[PDB]
Each structure stands twice: as C-alpha cells, then as structure tokens.
Short mmCIF file of C-alpha atoms in Angstrom, two decimals:
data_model
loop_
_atom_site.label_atom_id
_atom_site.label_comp_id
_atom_site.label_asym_id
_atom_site.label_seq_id
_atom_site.Cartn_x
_atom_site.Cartn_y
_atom_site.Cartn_z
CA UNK A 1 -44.77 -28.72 -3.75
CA UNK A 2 -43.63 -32.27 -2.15
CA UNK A 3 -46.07 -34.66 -1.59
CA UNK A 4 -45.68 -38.49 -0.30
CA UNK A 5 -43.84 -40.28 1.58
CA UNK A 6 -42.89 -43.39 3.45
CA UNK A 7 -41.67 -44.93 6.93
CA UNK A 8 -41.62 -41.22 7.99
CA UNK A 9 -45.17 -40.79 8.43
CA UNK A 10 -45.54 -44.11 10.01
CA UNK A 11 -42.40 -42.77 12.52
CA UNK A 12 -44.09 -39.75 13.36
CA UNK A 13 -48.01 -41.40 14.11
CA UNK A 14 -46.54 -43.63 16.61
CA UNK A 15 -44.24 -40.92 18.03
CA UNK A 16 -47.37 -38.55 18.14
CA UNK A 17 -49.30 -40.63 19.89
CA UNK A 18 -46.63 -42.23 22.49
CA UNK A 19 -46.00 -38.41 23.41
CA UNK A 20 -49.19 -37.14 22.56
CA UNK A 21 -47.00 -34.39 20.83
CA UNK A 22 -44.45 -33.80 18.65
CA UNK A 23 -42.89 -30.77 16.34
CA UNK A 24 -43.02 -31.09 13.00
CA UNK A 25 -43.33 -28.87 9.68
CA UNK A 26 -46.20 -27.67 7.68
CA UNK A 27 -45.79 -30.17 5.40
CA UNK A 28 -45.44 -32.72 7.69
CA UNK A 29 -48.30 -32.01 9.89
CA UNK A 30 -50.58 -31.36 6.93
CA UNK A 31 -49.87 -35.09 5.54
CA UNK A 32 -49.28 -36.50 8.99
CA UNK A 33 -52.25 -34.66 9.89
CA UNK A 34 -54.55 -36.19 7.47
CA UNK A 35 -53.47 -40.26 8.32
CA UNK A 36 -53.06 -39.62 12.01
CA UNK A 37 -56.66 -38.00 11.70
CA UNK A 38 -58.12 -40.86 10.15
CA UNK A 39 -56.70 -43.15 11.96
CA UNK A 40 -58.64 -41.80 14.98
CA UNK A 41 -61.91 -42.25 12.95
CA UNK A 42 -60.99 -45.72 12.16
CA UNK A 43 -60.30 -46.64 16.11
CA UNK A 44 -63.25 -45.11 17.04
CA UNK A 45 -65.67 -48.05 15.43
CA UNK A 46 -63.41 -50.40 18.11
CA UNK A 47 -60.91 -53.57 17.48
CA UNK A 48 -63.70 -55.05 15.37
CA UNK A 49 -62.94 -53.58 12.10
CA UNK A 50 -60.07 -54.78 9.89
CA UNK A 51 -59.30 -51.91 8.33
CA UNK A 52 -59.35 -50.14 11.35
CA UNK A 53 -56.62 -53.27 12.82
CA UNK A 54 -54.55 -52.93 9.33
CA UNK A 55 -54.99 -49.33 9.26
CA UNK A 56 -53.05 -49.12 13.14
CA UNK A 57 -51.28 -51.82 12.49
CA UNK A 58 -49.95 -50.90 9.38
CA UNK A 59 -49.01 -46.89 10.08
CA UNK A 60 -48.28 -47.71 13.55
CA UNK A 61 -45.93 -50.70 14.47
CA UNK A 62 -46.16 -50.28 18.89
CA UNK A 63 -47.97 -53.24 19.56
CA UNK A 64 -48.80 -51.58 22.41
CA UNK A 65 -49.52 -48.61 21.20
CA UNK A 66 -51.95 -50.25 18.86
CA UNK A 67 -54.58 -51.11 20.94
CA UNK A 68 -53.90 -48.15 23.61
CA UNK A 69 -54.87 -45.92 21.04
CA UNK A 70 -58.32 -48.02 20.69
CA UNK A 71 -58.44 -48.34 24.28
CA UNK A 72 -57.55 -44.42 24.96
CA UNK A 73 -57.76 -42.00 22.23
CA UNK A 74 -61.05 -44.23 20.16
CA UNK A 75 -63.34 -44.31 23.36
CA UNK A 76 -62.02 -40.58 24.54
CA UNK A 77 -62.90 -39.24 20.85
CA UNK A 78 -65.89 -41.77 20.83
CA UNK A 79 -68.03 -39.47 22.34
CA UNK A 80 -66.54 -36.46 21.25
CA UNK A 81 -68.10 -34.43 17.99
CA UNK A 82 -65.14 -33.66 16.23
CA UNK A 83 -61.65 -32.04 16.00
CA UNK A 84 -59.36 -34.97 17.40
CA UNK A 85 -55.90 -33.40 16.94
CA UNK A 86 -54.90 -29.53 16.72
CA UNK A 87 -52.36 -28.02 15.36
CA UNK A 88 -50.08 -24.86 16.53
CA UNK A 89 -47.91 -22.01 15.21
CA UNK A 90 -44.01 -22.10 16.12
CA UNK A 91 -41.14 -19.99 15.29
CA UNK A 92 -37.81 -21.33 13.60
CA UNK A 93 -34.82 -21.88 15.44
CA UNK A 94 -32.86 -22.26 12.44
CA UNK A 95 -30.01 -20.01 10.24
CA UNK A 96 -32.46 -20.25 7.69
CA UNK A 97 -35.57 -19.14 7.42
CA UNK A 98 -37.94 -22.31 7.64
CA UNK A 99 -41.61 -23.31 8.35
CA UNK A 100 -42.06 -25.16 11.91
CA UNK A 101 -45.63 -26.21 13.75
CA UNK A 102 -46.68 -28.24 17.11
CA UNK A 103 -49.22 -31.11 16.92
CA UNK A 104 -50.95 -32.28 20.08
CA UNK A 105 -54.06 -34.81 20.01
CA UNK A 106 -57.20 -32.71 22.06
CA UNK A 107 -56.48 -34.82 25.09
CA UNK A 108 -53.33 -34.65 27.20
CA UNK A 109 -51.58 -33.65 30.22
CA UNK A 110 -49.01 -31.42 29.73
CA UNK A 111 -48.22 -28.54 30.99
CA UNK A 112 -49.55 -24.66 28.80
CA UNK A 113 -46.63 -22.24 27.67
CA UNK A 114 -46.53 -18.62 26.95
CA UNK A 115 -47.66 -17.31 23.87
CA UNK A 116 -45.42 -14.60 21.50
CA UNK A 117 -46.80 -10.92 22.90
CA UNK A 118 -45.11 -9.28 19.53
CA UNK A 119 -47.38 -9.29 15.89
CA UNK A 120 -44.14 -10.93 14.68
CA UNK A 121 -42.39 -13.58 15.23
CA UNK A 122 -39.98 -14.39 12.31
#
C-alpha cells in the first residue's frame, strides 16, 4: 500500500524516544519501527561510529536527545539480547473504522493499563 516518507518519521523517533511512547498506526509503526529499531543497533557500538552519529543525528534533531539515547537506551540495550522496542494492539476512537497501535521502547517507567476482557474490540 503506502510506503515512504519524510520529516514524519524523523518527528515521530525523537518523539518516541523523549516519551518513550507514542500512538501511532500500523503503517507508521511498521516503518517507524524499522529506523527507530536500527537506530538502537547503531547506538549500541557507542559515539564512536559515524554512521551511528549521522544516523541519530540525521533522524533525530534533539541534540540532547542524541546522545541520551547513546548514553540511555545504547548501554541499557547493550547488554540486552534482543527485542529493543515492542509494539501493542489499540482500538480506534474514530467515526471510521481505522487501524491504531502503541509503541513503547522495552525500558520505561510508566504506569500498566487494563487490557480489553471481550474477543472483540472493533
């Protein structure tokens, strides 16, 4: 279906990461999913490698958040074997029908909510 995009992606890494969550679609998620996930990889090896700088630098713009995520996320993942981010089912709050989903980076400190008893949720 669609596929590519600009300044929207970069929006939603740094957003992601400054909240450690945010809501976004399937499509969205997928494609966000797939830079924010190697961007982790990248931040892991440390502020050493350039492509790991450009790579940050250049999807997110928070100076700060730049090297935060190598000095947070990178050595917290570091040691970790895999599965940095995870993503969640949501329902639509919309008139129409539509296709929602929660990211969250395995790491952070808020608070759990209840999940849907019912087999469906719309």
């Amino acid at each position: 279906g669609s596929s590519g995009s600009s300044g929207l992606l970069r929006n939603l890494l740094t957003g992601l990461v400054r909240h450690e969550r945010i809501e976004a679609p399937w499509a969205r998620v997928d494609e966000m999913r797939g830079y924010a996930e190697k961007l982790i990889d990248y931040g892991k090896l440390g502020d050493t490698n350039e492509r790991a700088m450009r790579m940050a630098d250049f999807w997110l713009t928070e100076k700060d958040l730049i090297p935060k995520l190598f000095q947070v996320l990178a050595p917290r993942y570091k040691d970790q074997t895999g599965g940095y981010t995870r993503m969640l089912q949501i329902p639509n709050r919309s008139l129409d029908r539509a296709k929602m989903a929660v990211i969250e980076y395995k790491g952070n400190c808020l608070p759990p909510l209840p999940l849907p008893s019912g087999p469906s949720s719309g």
